[PDB]
């Protein structure tokens, strides 16, 4: 179907909701009837994982500049639920709040963990928010 053997993709671990860089190694039937089998780029040793089509995307690397961020946008961004001031994983999220002074910028989003959602997370890496194609 939509993504091809050997295509570089992002794949979402449906347990934890985070997206990781991966490669399609095999495509089988069960687009909603397609199963992607992927390997994560720096972990050949961890084998192949089966993904539903909704948990695979082309690698979208279009940054949305600070000024263009808007409340209500569903975007891809970096968050760490266990240490919220630190670098974490990549998640889908809906921008919920945006605040700026001359010296400070704050961004809040409702982060999707697949299982639950996490409203108004404070997002630290406001200059690495990415667009979702869709
Ligand atoms: C947006 N992004 C994503 C992933 C990355 N490793 C990197 C970016 C940006 C740099 C590395 C995984 C899923 C989305
Ligand atoms: C670090 N990591 C983690 C998970 C992954 N699926 C992948 C990585 C790296 C690529 C795939 C689940 C929890 C942590």
Numbering used by the authors: 133 to 162, 179 to 282
What does the paper say about this structure?
To uncover the specific interactions between UHRF1_TTD and compound 1, we also solved the crystal structure of UHRF1_TTD in complex with compound 1. Two UHRF1_TTD molecules are present in each asymmetric unit of the UHRF1-compound 1 complex structure, but we only observed the expected disc-shaped electron density of compound 1 in the histone H3K9me3-binding cage of one UHRF1_TTD molecule, while we found a differently shaped blob in the histone H3K9me3-binding cage of the other UHRF1_TTD molecule. Intriguingly, we found the disc-shaped density that resembles compound 1 in the R296-binding pockets of both UHRF1_TTD molecules, and compound 1 is stacked between the indole ring system of W238 and the guanidinium group of R209 in both UHRF1_TTD molecules. Several lines of evidence suggested that the R296-binding pocket is the major binding site and the methyllysine-binding aromatic cage is just a minor or non-specific binding site. First, when we mutated the aromatic cage residues of UHRF1_TTD that have been shown to be critical for histone H3K9me3 binding to alanine, the binding affinity of compound 1 is not affected significantly. In contrast, when we mutated the R296-binding pocket residues, the binding is totally disrupted. Second, the electron density inside the H3K9me3 aromatic cage is either smear and can be modeled in multiple orientations of compound 1, which implies that compound 1 does not bind to the cage specifically, or is of no defined density shape. However, the three aromatic residues in the aromatic cage of UHRF1 are perpendicular to each other, which could not stack the compound like SMN does. Taken together, UHRF1 used the R296-binding pocket to specifically bind to compound 1, and this R296-binding pocket could serve as a therapeutic venue for designing potent small molecule allosteric regulators of the UHRF1 functions. UHRF1, however, did not bind to any other three-ring compounds, because the substituents on the pyridine nitrogen of these compounds are too large to accommodate the more enclosed arginine-binding pocket of UHRF1.
